[PDB]
Design a protein around this ligand. Structure first.
Ligand SMILES: NC(=O)c1ccc[n+]([C@@H]2O[C@H](COP(=O)([O-])OP(=O)(O)OC[C@H]3O[C@@H](n4cnc5c(N)ncnc54)[C@H](O)[C@@H]3O)[C@@H](O)[C@H]2O)c1
Ligand SMILES: NC(=O)c1ccc[n+]([C@@H]2O[C@H](COP(=O)([O-])OP(=O)(O)OC[C@H]3O[C@@H](n4cnc5c(N)ncnc54)[C@H](O)[C@@H]3O)[C@@H](O)[C@H]2O)c1
Ligand SMILES: NC(=O)c1ccc[n+]([C@@H]2O[C@H](COP(=O)([O-])OP(=O)(O)OC[C@H]3O[C@@H](n4cnc5c(N)ncnc54)[C@H](O)[C@@H]3O)[C@@H](O)[C@H]2O)c1
Ligand SMILES: NC(=O)c1ccc[n+]([C@@H]2O[C@H](COP(=O)([O-])OP(=O)(O)OC[C@H]3O[C@@H](n4cnc5c(N)ncnc54)[C@H](O)[C@@H]3O)[C@@H](O)[C@H]2O)c1
Lengths: 333, 334, 334, 334
């Protein structure tokens, strides 16, 4: 199985490691985060406000972590060029700092001997992939992106609807949990002015390319889909709200059938289908990219419908990072 | 000038009272709520988790409330047929209990001498009005409805866009603060299973007739608009998300100009226009029905747009209740 | 293995069922809740905003629930005297509705054939027990009380410190999650004015007898301990803050060693001891009554100390309900 | 009136500016914050999630702010030694960055022409003052501290009780709103592991010198008071929980009378007294240091009592900064 390094031991970094240990699909052999010392890393991994306590064994030994018997090297370099990935055999680097999302910045990991870099975020210039949507277009690039949590929710849904019914145009709102880039109380934000307002007290509109990025992993939809997001006071779990017009005449039951069929077939494990009366906490720690909520949507007429899909923005995306490393390593061989 | 009675001294009942006192546009002379004694009512009106402390004077004087030197009768009748509205001269009754929303149930207020009843909610069998949209169609019905907060947000915006660009079809999501019918922890809500889950910890989808009701106050949009709601962990203030297709070709700048124009003219005080980077707390205790957020919307192409508009679901709607009573009282006088 | 019926399928009722299934220490064979139909009951038990999804299997078969293959009768009786506990063999009845906490009202279960009633709350007159503190004083009463979540947190801690150091006097604050009796938005609470204010937006002082009740389960502490609570914006998990004066001289390390010793011996599974840097979510779904937080306390001097102890007010208490039934059934048989 | 500069336009800096404008007691003529450009500063000041919209008028002119007609210079210097305070005549500097809390660091402001520096936080090596407690001990130090929000709450209460009843010993818990140092989701806080956990989902214990500092502003209480903090999911407003033993015998009514008397005389505007059933939001934007909550406290016996006092940790503290500057300016002038 691929040997993995994680740069940035944050929400995504720690949850990617949970998914690695849970599945065994990759072997995380090295960790880097200059703002966290090894003993502190043990604390942050063991206790989690969102996904509950870690259920395995973890201890510090020397400057390293030991998790269920396996040693993980822990470094504290601010410059990714100084991380010696080769000492542990770390070949596939998860770049989850949030500060090295361009190909140039991410490519620093090759200095320490990395083989591939997976940016855990959209990138201005690295090719983006969404498992179940366009992984087969992978063509060997050294630095790649797994897009965003929101794109991983919308794109499997949009691909399925387009294939069956032909999307003419669509607009998305992502009703999204607050994240680490937001603030407890009103303070300065680097992304945008609204982004700094008290996270747990506000609905906060936020612009996003993640719906437009659907048009890059699904070229047939370029220029046909865009949208925005509203950050809301939940610590985790988000909801895609997708209003879309089809070329074909559909009923809503036919929309549901198309989703159900994809969830039981080509997108099983990626796109789920439910008719239960679920709320956001029911999707906590669920590893799907996208769970279509049959009862939450509505059709106005035979061509114009609203559909809704849930995603654990931390947990589903993080499993997809693992899935994308496994797939790319197969192709590289 | 119009003398008002309020049945149900809840979020809407009390916030209607603050708007009456703030504007002086109506004189509230009587209140009824069987689950609040007069001393408790003073406390509930004095302190408010959402809109801050009442800035005036209030005291209890023997079963009555006195606010800024004016006596307000206070009753505790479970049956609205037993409220002697005539004793205080209350003629226009705000029916804001949530349990008397039909013409039959709301008509009980006439037994005690009410002249008109305004149901603070959509109604199955009473005409619905949205100020700035269709109040001129009022023709003397004795039981009327002020619709919902959400319809009061969407309809003035849809009217403006329809008038200027012709709406082909539109779908709405109301991202809505939690309310009194929701629960702190997972509890029974047998008629709305999701609505029983812990309110401040969940995103909670809900169906709503509020967008379809836009096609009832704007008959030209009948069959062209519907939508749903998502209840979210805020104590107040909500956000309409409107995805709409126009028959005419538009730029987003043209959409903004149409809204700004209406806000500076025929819908002043009802529909506001902003380009500021606001968030929900900035709309707290704002009396507009609808505040169009120009930087939050987006146009995909020349006919297909998503626009967003804020509303204080408590304070905007409550000011409209006062506005509607004034308007109807004037019409009842000629 | 005792056969249990649960009356009131609420937070405590459902979490008691979770604890019964998790441990197998009792067999829940019947449930009653008039406000929940069987298909709704499956939903409310399957999905939980606080403790997550149920990991086993559950379905409805006819009017019953089937959980992990076992059939569980489900009734919908408003009057507990009409619940036919006998049909399923239910002998030990968890009275978790919140509304039948006196012996007079709780005794209604005996009509349907109950053998014992455990009130999931303090009782005005039924004897109260805290596992680890006074269950040996149980003498065969047919209606008993498992006290409150807070008493179950404070009393095992107070007993240990009293046994070792002699408590002269103590005052407690329970920093407590909000509960089902609180309100999402400012609402009517005629017997607890503060308790009606928006739960997720306020710190809400509240008086409690739960610290004085430590004086009933530990009679030597009668009149030496009381306190109050503050209800805070968390959906679950609470924290006892105990400020206490000892007759003996102690260091804070001796305080810690006494609690660690108790946690490894006589109070294992009831009182836990930690030096970790935990926060409230770390105690979610933790079955202990009391988790002493070593780093959160502080000593002013050799006789005056502040200790703090965590408790999942739903899950800890609910496991104690299961433990108490087990203990009492053993006593009933020898 | 004194001319003021503010280094650090954060929660305290902006709420200090609001208090200066509200009272006119000082004239703010310059601001510095390298992370907030002028147009961003206008937005952050105009719109506040906690205290609401700014009521006055504000605009940017070039690189400076203009607020209600007066120009305010705005700099973005990361090194306070480079702020040209003299250009605007700013003499009294509010040091509210959180990062220059020592006499050596705060002294950087003198390079730019400042006359006095008031650190908006406790300091390891500058004298701390609490208005109503020890401001008369000021004797011309050039770098002073206004202590913390929590010490400004506890000290006036502790002085009053100790003056009348003699405090033998006391322990405090500050139930405290979360602040800008905390995190929205679990993130790094290597000096305070608990302080990194999701602020709005957790109760978070924390050590604090704020209770011990009461023994520094009140030397007669040295060694007799300490405590800790629990950070909770509110955006603002905190609650002091003070458990104290007196040397004299007292009733609770006598405790109440002593607090009320102080609130009406020497501590007016500093310590408030209430018997209302208030909750945290009722203290929002209240400028008192300390609001004694009569009904929330409890006496165990004639010497052992728990008292509770509310404080808007942003607004009360900020008004005290303004008050301290006024007082120091008058003493500086004779
Ligand atoms: N949280 C989500 O829902 C989510 C979902 C999908 C993608 N993402 C993306 O994943 C990335 C990480 O997000 P997050 O939520 O985990 O953020 P986070 O703040 O929780 O974690 C980022 C971590 O990177 C560390 N770091 C900072 N500078 C560093 C450096 N120079 N070298 C190494 N480590 C450094 C920080 O200490 C922190 O622990 C971001 O790009 C984000 O946009 C986040
Ligand atoms: N809250 C909102 O945002 C909002 C906005 C627009 C409209 N509304 C509508 O306004 C109505 C009231 O909503 P609310 O949020 O104020 O609810 P609420 O629960 O806060 O208020 C209801 C009040 O009615 C009282 N009441 C109950 N039974 C009564 C009776 N028999 N006689 C007299 N009074 C009685 C209750 O004691 C309570 O004080 C509802 O129909 C709601 O749909 C609410
Ligand atoms: N939640 C806690 O933290 C906690 C902890 C310890 C003890 N308790 C006590 O346990 C009891 C239950 O509390 P809860 O938090 O589970 O409340 P809850 O509201 O979650 O549960 C009450 C349940 O009882 C049902 N009920 C109402 N009337 C009934 C009737 N006549 N017959 C049968 N069922 C009826 C309701 O439908 C509801 O499902 C209360 O007395 C409470 O004080 C609660
Ligand atoms: N918030 C409270 O309740 C409270 C109460 C009393 C005291 N305090 C104290 O006041 C101080 C500020 O607290 P806050 O809550 O306002 O924090 P905050 O983060 O809201 O404000 C800090 C401000 O200082 C600015 N800043 C950072 N580095 C700077 C530099 N080199 N030069 C100039 N400005 C810089 C930041 O941009 C930010 O605007 C802290 O010392 C805090 O302990 C806070």
């Amino acid at each position: 199985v691929p040997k993995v390094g994680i740069n940035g031991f944050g929400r995504i970094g720690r949850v990617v490691l949970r998914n690695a240990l849970e599945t065994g699909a990759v072997e995380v052999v090295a960790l880097n985060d200059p703002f966290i010392e090894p003993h502190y890393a043990e604390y942050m991994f063991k206790y989690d406000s969102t996904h509950g306590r870690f259920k395995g064994d973890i201890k510090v030994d020397g400057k390293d972590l030991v998790i269920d018997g396996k040693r993980i090297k822990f470094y504290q370099e601010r410059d990714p060029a100084n991380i010696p990935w080769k000492d542990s055999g770390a070949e596939y680097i998860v770049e989850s700092t949030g500060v090295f999302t361009t190909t140039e910045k991410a490519s620093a990991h090759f200095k320490g001997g990395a083989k591939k870099v997976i940016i855990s975020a959209p990138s201005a210039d690295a090719p983006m992939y969404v498992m179940g949507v366009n992984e087969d277009t992978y063509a060997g690039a050294n630095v790649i992106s797994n897009a965003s949590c929101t794109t991983n929710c919308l794109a499997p849904l949009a691909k399925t609807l387009n294939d069956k019914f032909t999307i003419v145009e669509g607009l998305m709102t992502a009703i999204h949990a607050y994240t680490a880039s937001q603030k407890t109380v009103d303070g300065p934000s680097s992304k945008d002015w609204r982004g700094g307002r008290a996270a747990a007290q506000n609905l906060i509109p936020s612009s996003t390319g993640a719906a437009k990025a659907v048009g890059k992993v699904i070229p047939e939809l370029a220029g046909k889909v865009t949208g925005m997001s509203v950050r809301v006071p939940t610590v985790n779990v988000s909801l895609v709200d997708f209003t879309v017009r089809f070329a074909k005449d559909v009923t809503y039951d036919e929309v549901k059938a198309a989703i159900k069929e994809a969830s039981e077939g080509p997108l099983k494990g990626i796109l789920a289908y439910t008719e239960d009366d679920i709320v956001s906490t029911d999707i906590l720690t669920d590893p799907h990219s996208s769970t279509f909520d049959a009862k939450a949507g509505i059709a106005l007429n035979k061509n114009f419908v609203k559909v809704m899909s849930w995603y654990d923005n931390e947990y589903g995306y993080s499993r997809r990072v693992v899935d994308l490393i496994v797939f790319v390593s197969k192709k590289d061989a």
